[PDB]
CSV table of C-alpha atoms in Angstrom, one decimal:
chain,number,residue,atom,x,y,z
L,57,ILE,CA,0.0,0.0,0.0
L,58,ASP,CA,3.1,2.2,-0.4
L,59,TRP,CA,1.3,4.1,-3.3
L,60,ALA,CA,0.5,7.0,-0.9
L,61,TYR,CA,4.2,8.0,-0.9
L,62,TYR,CA,4.2,7.6,-4.7
L,63,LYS,CA,1.1,9.8,-4.9
L,64,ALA,CA,3.1,12.4,-2.9
L,65,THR,CA,5.9,12.0,-5.4
L,66,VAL,CA,3.3,12.0,-8.2
L,67,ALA,CA,2.7,15.5,-9.5
L,68,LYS,CA,-1.0,15.2,-8.6
L,69,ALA,CA,-0.4,15.2,-4.8
L,70,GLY,CA,-2.4,18.0,-3.3
L,71,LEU,CA,-6.0,16.8,-2.9
L,72,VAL,CA,-4.5,13.3,-3.0
L,73,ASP,CA,-2.9,14.2,0.3
L,74,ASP,CA,-6.3,14.8,1.8
L,75,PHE,CA,-7.6,11.5,0.3
L,76,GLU,CA,-4.6,9.7,1.8
L,77,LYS,CA,-5.6,11.2,5.1
L,78,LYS,CA,-8.9,9.7,4.4
L,79,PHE,CA,-7.2,6.5,3.3
L,80,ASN,CA,-5.4,6.1,6.7
L,81,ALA,CA,-8.8,6.2,8.4
L,82,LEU,CA,-10.0,3.1,6.5
L,83,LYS,CA,-10.7,0.0,8.6
L,84,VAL,CA,-11.3,-3.6,7.4
L,85,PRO,CA,-13.5,-5.9,9.4
L,86,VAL,CA,-12.4,-9.3,10.6
L,87,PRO,CA,-14.9,-12.2,10.3
L,88,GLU,CA,-15.7,-14.2,13.4
L,89,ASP,CA,-15.6,-17.9,13.5
L,90,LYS,CA,-19.0,-19.6,14.2
L,91,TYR,CA,-18.4,-23.4,13.9
L,92,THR,CA,-15.6,-23.5,16.4
L,93,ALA,CA,-18.0,-24.3,19.3
L,94,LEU,CA,-19.9,-26.8,17.2
L,95,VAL,CA,-16.8,-28.9,16.7
L,96,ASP,CA,-15.9,-28.8,20.4
L,97,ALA,CA,-19.5,-29.8,21.2
L,98,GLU,CA,-19.2,-33.4,19.8
L,99,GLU,CA,-15.9,-34.2,21.4
L,100,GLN,CA,-17.4,-34.7,24.9
L,101,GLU,CA,-20.0,-37.1,23.6
L,102,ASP,CA,-17.4,-39.1,21.7
L,103,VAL,CA,-15.2,-39.3,24.7
L,104,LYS,CA,-18.1,-40.6,26.8
L,105,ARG,CA,-18.9,-43.3,24.2
L,106,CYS,CA,-15.2,-44.3,24.1
L,107,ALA,CA,-15.1,-44.7,27.9
L,108,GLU,CA,-18.2,-46.8,27.9
L,109,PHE,CA,-16.8,-49.0,25.1
L,110,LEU,CA,-13.5,-49.4,27.0
L,111,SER,CA,-15.2,-50.5,30.2
I,8,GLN,CA,20.0,31.7,-38.1
I,9,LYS,CA,17.5,34.1,-39.7
I,10,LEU,CA,14.8,31.5,-39.9
I,11,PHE,CA,15.6,30.3,-36.3
I,12,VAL,CA,15.3,33.8,-34.9
I,13,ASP,CA,12.1,34.4,-36.8
I,14,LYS,CA,10.5,31.2,-35.5
I,15,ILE,CA,11.7,32.2,-31.9
I,16,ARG,CA,10.0,35.5,-32.3
I,17,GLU,CA,6.8,33.8,-33.4
I,18,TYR,CA,7.0,31.4,-30.5
I,19,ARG,CA,7.3,34.3,-28.2
I,20,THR,CA,4.3,35.8,-29.9
I,21,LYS,CA,2.4,32.6,-29.1
I,22,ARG,CA,3.6,32.9,-25.5
I,23,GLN,CA,2.2,36.5,-25.5
I,24,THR,CA,-1.3,35.0,-25.6
I,25,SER,CA,-3.1,35.3,-22.3
I,26,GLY,CA,-4.2,31.6,-22.5
I,27,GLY,CA,-4.9,28.8,-24.9
I,28,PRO,CA,-4.1,28.7,-28.6
I,29,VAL,CA,-4.4,31.8,-30.7
I,30,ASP,CA,-6.7,29.8,-32.9
I,31,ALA,CA,-9.0,28.1,-30.5
I,32,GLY,CA,-10.6,26.0,-33.2
I,33,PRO,CA,-14.3,25.3,-33.8
I,34,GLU,CA,-13.6,21.5,-33.7
I,35,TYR,CA,-10.7,21.3,-31.3
I,36,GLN,CA,-13.0,21.4,-28.3
I,37,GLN,CA,-15.3,18.9,-29.9
I,38,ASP,CA,-12.4,16.5,-30.6
I,39,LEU,CA,-11.0,16.9,-27.1
I,40,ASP,CA,-14.5,16.2,-25.7
I,41,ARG,CA,-14.9,13.1,-27.9
I,42,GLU,CA,-11.4,11.8,-26.8
I,43,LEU,CA,-12.2,12.4,-23.1
I,44,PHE,CA,-15.6,10.6,-23.5
I,45,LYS,CA,-13.8,7.6,-25.2
I,46,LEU,CA,-11.2,7.5,-22.4
I,47,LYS,CA,-13.9,7.7,-19.7
I,48,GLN,CA,-15.9,4.8,-21.4
I,49,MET,CA,-12.7,2.7,-21.8
I,50,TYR,CA,-11.4,3.2,-18.3
I,51,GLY,CA,-14.8,3.3,-16.6
I,52,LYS,CA,-16.7,6.0,-14.8
I,53,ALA,CA,-14.9,7.4,-11.7
I,54,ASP,CA,-15.7,10.1,-9.3
I,55,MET,CA,-13.3,12.6,-7.8
I,56,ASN,CA,-12.7,10.9,-4.5
I,57,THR,CA,-15.3,8.2,-4.0
I,58,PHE,CA,-14.0,5.3,-2.0
I,59,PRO,CA,-16.7,2.8,-1.4
I,60,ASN,CA,-16.2,0.3,1.4
I,61,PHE,CA,-18.6,-2.7,1.6
I,62,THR,CA,-17.7,-6.1,3.1
I,63,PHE,CA,-19.5,-9.3,2.3
I,64,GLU,CA,-20.0,-12.2,4.7
I,65,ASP,CA,-18.4,-15.7,4.6
I,66,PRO,CA,-19.4,-17.3,1.2
I,67,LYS,CA,-20.4,-21.0,1.0
I,68,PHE,CA,-19.8,-21.8,4.7
I,69,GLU,CA,-19.0,-25.5,4.9
I,70,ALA,CA,-19.8,-27.2,8.2
I,71,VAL,CA,-19.9,-30.6,9.8
I,72,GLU,CA,-23.7,-30.4,10.2
I,73,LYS,CA,-25.0,-33.7,9.0
I,74,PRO,CA,-27.3,-36.5,10.3
I,75,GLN,CA,-24.3,-38.8,11.0
I,76,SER,CA,-22.4,-36.0,12.9
C-alpha cells in the first residue's frame, strides 16, 4: 500500500494528500468464527462413548 | 540563423497569448470532448474521491452439520 508516498511524489499530490488522510482512516473488518463451538461440542459425547466402550 | 530567430519571435508571440491557442478551433474542443468521453468509457466511470467500502459475509460456509455427525 506504499502508493501513498508515490502519490506524494506523483505530480497530482495536493488533494490526493487529503484523500490519503482519508485512506489512513480506512478500517477492514475481521470475520468471526462460528463453527468452532460446534466442533468442540461433539468431542465430549465421543469421549463418553469411548469410555463406555472401553469399560 | 535568420529562420531560427524568426521562429523564436513567433513562438514568443504565441507565448504572448493570455491563455490557450491563438486559434481556439471550432472543432478542437469537440475533438477533445470526444477523446475524453472515449477515455472515460474505456477506463470506466470514476468520481473525484469516491472510496466505497462494503464487506461481504463468509461465502459458501462449509460445516460438519449432517445426520451422522
